Amino acid sequence: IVGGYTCGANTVPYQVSLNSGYHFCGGSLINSQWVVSAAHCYKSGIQVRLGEDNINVVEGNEQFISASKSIVHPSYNSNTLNNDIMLIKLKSAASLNSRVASISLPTSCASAGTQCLISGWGNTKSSGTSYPDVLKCLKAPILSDSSCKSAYPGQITSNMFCAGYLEGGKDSCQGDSGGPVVCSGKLQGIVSWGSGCAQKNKPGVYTKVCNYVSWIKQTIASN
Template sequence: SLQVRLGEHNIFSNEGTEQFISSAKVIRHPNYNSRILDNDIMLIKLSSPANLNSYVKTVSLPSGCAAAGTTCLISGWGNTLSSGTNYPDLLQCLNAPILSENDCNGSYPGEITKNMFCAGFLAGGKDSCQGDSGGPVVCNGQLHGVVSWGYGCAQRNYPGVYTKVCNFNSWIQTTMSSN
């Protein structure tokens, strides 16, 4: 089983806010395609309930799909260098805009499915990276994306690609209620 760490901030020191809960079940999307990374989403059922407090909170599912230009917060403990390796101790955060379908398809022709969107900066310099995958993209307090893939990290004209959570609302709700 997986161990889920909640309330984490500095992954190398115990700050007293963490909760460690093992997974009871890991549910991959039935149509996940590892070759093209379509339907890149999964759910983890905890073996015991999380204790919600000021360090551990839930995030809302999206009420609709977010528009291009919406600013979102992307976070993780992934690599902070585009060439080379530096994994940080502290949770890193980036404010980044959702890009238009046109820009996204222009960067990755033929590779973007209806279940993906791009976010970040075509100029490069700021992006999610290895070690951030599976992490959240939160826009206006709602979970709109999951860190999925990209070409390198923070490269010019190659923004990050994210799972489009709004397309999976019903799968998430159905799966949660039946498990």
């Protein structure tokens, strides 16, 4: 997260870190056994880390649970990034408490201008790299479809939306992929892609979770 702030320990209790000997992507806990992330984050050997603040210190409240299933959307396109969503089933159910909690799926899509919370352990610099120990947060608005398509001609599908800023300086960045965009208490987005990070006229692009609620429910119910 570039241009954000330190969230505070366990203030984003649905945020997870996907770990393979290092933090590589985020995710969102949606029930005690299932995490939503991005399809491009798929790999073997994922350990889900819940309850984290400082990802490099065991501070208390962590739960480390192996992924038992990683389900990439069958229609994920690795070139256009359409359908950039993955469901991870945990090997055992997480213990839910104030510091580890699920986030609700949306009942409707969110309108342009709605304020959202984007969070993660990604790079905090728009030029160069600095990776934080503790979780970072950014308040960012949903942008209009017409502004999103103007920024990224020919690249925005019906399953994507833009959020953030056009003036530069505030955005999600590398290491934030798969993590949450939460608006009015609902998970509306998954960090996906952009042209660089925090660049003028190039806002972040996010998977539109409202389009996948039925798919998520059907997949969980059958697994």
